[PDB]
Amino acid sequence: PKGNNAIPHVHQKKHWNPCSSQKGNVKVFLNQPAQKHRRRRLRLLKAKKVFPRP
């Protein structure tokens, strides 16, 4: 049976999942802490380079 549930609209009918025949269309954030570290390091290096300017 189905019963009393919300009518679903989940919007996943395109080839988004990478499989044996599809490249997929996805974006993950597994590099977030590394990129945060890189940005802070770049800011510190740039400040050292342009010292004493703000």
Binding site: K2, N4, I7, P8
Partner: protein, 72 residues
């Protein structure tokens, strides 16, 4: 966690709670919201009154910031 699911309890039952007669087939009633007026009409009418039709005027380019108005 996989160790709390019904599959672990059903190992050895050969049918996993879907019956010998009806069985577990692919799509026995169509996919998604199909048949809302034909063979799912009772469900749609008793649980979701007002799903079908049109009502009211249209507002083409809605901007919510000019409509912001909270109350206390």
């Amino acid at each position: 966690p996989t160790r709390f699911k019904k599959c672990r309890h059903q190992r050895g039952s050969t049918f996993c709670g879907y019956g010998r007669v009806g069985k577990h087939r692919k799509h026995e009633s169509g996919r998604g919201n199909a048949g809302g007026m034909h063979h799912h009409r009772i469900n749609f009418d008793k649980y979701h009154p007002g799903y079908f039709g049109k009502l009211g005027m249209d507002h083409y380019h809605r901007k919510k910031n000019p409509m912001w108005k909270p109350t206390i």
